[PDB]
């Protein structure tokens, strides 16, 4: 219902969206464009990394999980710098920067 109506943005529907990708997909189907019970890409993209930074998404020591969160929200610079710090994934982060360049 609230995937069709883009409502109840605060309720993460955790009963059915238990994975991270299920959350991203749940919200990107809820973002809106031009006051209550409404979320926009700017709020969502900022809300995610500002409040729930790397710390929240890298506790499982899985780096790509956070990268996908930033890249699939149009925050390409964040995801590039972030992934560029993983000494094992420097190569990959430089190139995804070149492509964007």
């Amino acid at each position: 219902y609230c995937i069709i109506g883009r409502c109840d943005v605060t309720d993460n529907q955790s009963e059915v969206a238990d994975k991270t990708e299920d959350y991203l997909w749940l919200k990107l189907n809820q973002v809106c464009f031009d006051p209550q019970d409404r979320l926009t890409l700017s709020q969502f993209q900022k809300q995610l990394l500002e409040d729930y930074g790397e710390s929240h998404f890298t506790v499982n020591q899985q780096p790509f999980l956070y990268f996908q969160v930033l890249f699939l929200t149009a925050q390409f610079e964040a995801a590039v710098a972030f992934l560029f710090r993983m000494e094992r994934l420097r190569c990959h982060a430089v190139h995804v920067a070149l492509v964007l360049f």
């Binding site: 238990d18 994975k19 991270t20 959350y23």
Partner: peptide, 8 residues
């Protein structure tokens, strides 16, 4: 309260 469990 988003989960941190990656789709595996």
């Amino acid at each position: 309260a988003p989960p941190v469990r990656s789709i595996y």
